[PDB]
C-alpha cells in the first residue's frame, strides 16, 4: 500500500537526524541511511526500500545524479532535499524519471505533502509502464496525462496527487485506460 520501509541519503547530520525522526515520528521504518551518493544507488538496489528521501548535493555522486539513476530503474519513489534555489536542478532532471523536490528547511508539514507527490508520480509512472504497451506510445500517454492533470488542477482546484488519482480511479471505473480518460479531460476543459 503506502510506503512504510525508507532509505535516506543526506551527508549533513543534523538533517538526517532530522529527518528520521520526523519519519519514525508518522510510521516509517528507516532501513538505510547513506551519506554519499554512490551508496545511496548500492543500498537503494541491495534493500529494495518503499521510498527514498536524497539530498540534490551528495559526495562521490551527486543526488540528482543518483536520483536519476535510482528513478530508472523504477524502485521507488523519490524525494530530493533542495535549497530554494537550486529547485531548477531537480525540474531539469524528472527528465530521467518521476521525483519531487522538497525545499530545505523543512518540517513534517512539509515533508508529508512532498513525500504524497513523489509517491503520486511514482505510481503514475508504474501504471504507465503496465498499461501501453510500447515505449513511444508510452511517451505521448504520459505527456497527456500531464495535459490533463494541468487542468484537473487549474479548473477543478486539485493538488496534483489528486489529480492524477482521479484519473486513475475514472479509468478503472470506467473499464478502460487512463489513455482515453485523459484524452476526454482534454477535450472538455482543454
Known sequence: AVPRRVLIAEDEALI??????????????IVGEAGDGQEAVELAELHKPDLVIMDVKMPRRDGI??????????????????????????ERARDAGAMAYLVKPFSISDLIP???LAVSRFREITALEG???TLSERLETRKLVERAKGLLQTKHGMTEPDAFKWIQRAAM?????????????????G
Open 65 to 90: 545524479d543518483a536520483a536519476s539513476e535510482i528513478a530508472s530503474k523504477r524502485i521507488a519513489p523519490i524525494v530530493v532535499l533542495t535549497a530554494f534555489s537550486q529547485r531548477d536542478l531537480v
Open 16 to 29: 538526517r537526524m532530522d529527518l528520521a525522526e520526523m519519519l519514525r515520528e508518522e510510521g516509517y521504518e
Open 114 to 116: 512532498a513525500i504524497e
Open 173 to 189: 471505473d470506467r473499464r478502460t485506460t487512463m489513455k482515453r480518460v485523459a484524452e476526454v479531460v482534454l477535450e472538455t476543459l
Open 131 to 133: 498499461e501501453v504497451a
